[PDB]
């Protein structure tokens, strides 16, 4: 209650402090957006495999992006970054995180245990122990409180769209989590119920529907081209009755914006 407004304002202030450098991928000599897309999708699988929370995934992605923002990494070592980030997120977010051996095991023993632990140590240094990042997932759960009443399909779909954003560094690094979450929530709300970005949320966020358009346009295309995309773990994950099979809902042809 009395803290809800302050927490939003705070995550807003912090999401600027925890954003990666937008054009870091252009300065990474040996990795592409494509490689990262492969990595994040694999993490989605790991997240399903070990039944880890969705917050854990979002955090890991943020650690990976922030890491790469200042550290050149060879392709052969990208996954090592990915693994350790996932380990750290598990340690931060999960109640009982999977043991290191489990994070070793899932890489077909490409890296030893000695390596993963050292990478954890290095990521902690590079991130300067700053692990409590705001995520799309965090902003959605806030925006959900502004539903009248709460609609489970809307929520699962918005979640699905936000999750999809993680995969494609182009364009989504262009947008703050609060913005993506906004675009996601509106799109899901429009798909399921027909309603739009509510008045209450406009006031809270300061974001008008008009200001959400650019991001909304991009997210709409990702939603449309979802079954053609090279990475597919999230779609599979959200076909599940757990998330009301939302990945099978037909996207609207136009957004009437």
């Amino acid at each position: 209650p009395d803290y809800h407004e302050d927490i939003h304002t705070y995550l807003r202030e912090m999401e600027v402090k925890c954003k990666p450098k937008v054009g870091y991928m252009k300065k990474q000599p040996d990795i592409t957006n494509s490689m990262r897309a492969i990595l994040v999708d694999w993490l989605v699988e790991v997240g399903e495999e070990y039944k880890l929370q969705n917050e854990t995934l979002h955090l890991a992605v943020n650690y990976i992006d922030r890491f790469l923002s200042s550290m050149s990494v060879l392709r052969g070592k990208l996954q090592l970054v990915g693994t350790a980030a996932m380990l750290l997120a598990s340690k931060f977010e999960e109640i009982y995180p999977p043991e290191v051996a489990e994070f070793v095991y899932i890489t077909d023993d490409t890296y030893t245990k000695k390596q993963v632990l050292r990478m954890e140590h290095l990521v902690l240094k590079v991130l300067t122990f700053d692990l409590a990042a705001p995520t799309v997932n965090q902003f959605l759960t806030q925006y959900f409180l502004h539903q009248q009443p709460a609609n489970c399909k809307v929520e699962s779909l918005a979640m699905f769209l936000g999750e999809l954003s993680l995969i494609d560094a182009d364009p989504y690094l262009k947008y703050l989590p609060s913005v993506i979450a906004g675009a996601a929530f509106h799109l899901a709300l429009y798909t399921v119920t027909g309603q739009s970005w509510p008045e209450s949320l406009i006031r809270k966020t300061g974001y008008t529907l008009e200001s959400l358009k650019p991001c909304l346009m991009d997210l709409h295309q990702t939603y449309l081209k979802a079954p053609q995309h090279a990475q597919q773990s999230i779609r599979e994950k959200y076909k599940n009755s757990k998330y009301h099979g939302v990945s099978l809902l037909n996207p609207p042809e136009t957004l009437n914006l």
Partner: protein, 292 residues
């Protein structure tokens, strides 16, 4: 790490040892927290560092530095002289004066209000985790079990038994800020009475003690309570006792604030922000304690 002369051991943990130490170059007195390192950096260490880094407040303990080596991991804190528990025993005979109990609660609620405003649950408030100095300051410490929300924090199948909120004991899926207020509630009473309010020796005993004092919760007072995972229909139905018999030395405002802090249903339990404006603090001052 080479600048710190270890002065005297002051704590024992599973993660590692805490020493009082001094900076050989600047003379600053600090609390060093050693953490021994095969599961990598302990999660509690990761949480404590990460969350304290953010929380800069006069009523939260200040993490000064994190010395990060290959083989050892150190947490540098501003030094505080003793915990509240040691002061409570040192007060056992004479008692803590009300002006000072009022000051302590006021400050604690301020630290806590700051935590909650930055999406941080403490989850483990207790006399041992609350640090005092000789100038009347009190600070929240040990953020090892502290947790970030903004995504609701799920409960396990942690907390010290005595200061646990009833919703946890009754098996609630999620934590909330309400659990930190409950804890402070118990600490408040304890400073007033010189005795732990609910000193259970087991989980069910802890629950029953809360019941004998505040009454056994029903659906009228707490909607949903009888549906909660660990609720049992065979629970004895105790009647609510008069707070004038629970906390005698407290005035009407004291009892008022306390009851709202020990409110059953988490949703209606007073928040730290709201408790700060309660009539109880109309004349709050900053008295200094006498420490041995």
């Amino acid at each position: 790490m080479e600048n710190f002369q270890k002065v005297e051991k002051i704590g024992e943990g599973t993660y590692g040892v805490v020493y009082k130490a001094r900076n050989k170059l600047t003379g600053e007195v600090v609390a060093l927290k050693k953490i021994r390192l095969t599961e990598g950096v302990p999660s509690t260490a990761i949480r404590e560092i990460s969350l304290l880094k953010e929380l800069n407040h006069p009523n939260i303990v200040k993490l000064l530095d994190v010395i990060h080596t290959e083989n050892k991991l150190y947490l540098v804190f501003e030094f505080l002289h003793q915990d509240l528990k040691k002061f409570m025993d040192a007060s056992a005979l004479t008692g803590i004066p009300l002006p000072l109990i009022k000051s302590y609660l006021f400050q604690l609620l301020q630290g806590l209000a700051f935590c909650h405003s930055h999406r941080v649950l403490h989850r483990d408030l207790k006399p041992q985790n609350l640090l005092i100095n000789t100038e009347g300051a009190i600070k929240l410490a040990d953020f090892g079990l502290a947790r970030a929300f903004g995504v609701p924090v799920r409960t396990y199948t942690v907390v010290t038994l005595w200061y646990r909120a009833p919703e946890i004991l009754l098996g609630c899926k999620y934590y909330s800020t309400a659990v930190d207020i409950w804890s402070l509630g118990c600490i408040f009473a304890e400073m007033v009475t010189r005795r732990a309010l609910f000193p259970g020796d087991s989980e069910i005993d802890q629950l029953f003690r809360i019941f004998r004092t505040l009454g056994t919760p029903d659906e009228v007072v707490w909607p949903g309570v009888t549906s909660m995972p660990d609720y049992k229909p065979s629970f004895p139905k105790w009647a609510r006792q008069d707070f004038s018999k629970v906390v005698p030395p407290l005035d009407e405002d004291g009892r008022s604030l306390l009851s709202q802090m020990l409110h059953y249903d988490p949703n209606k339990r007073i928040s730290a922000k709201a408790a700060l404006a309660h009539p109880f603090f109309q004349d709050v001052t900053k008295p200094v304690p006498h420490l041995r």
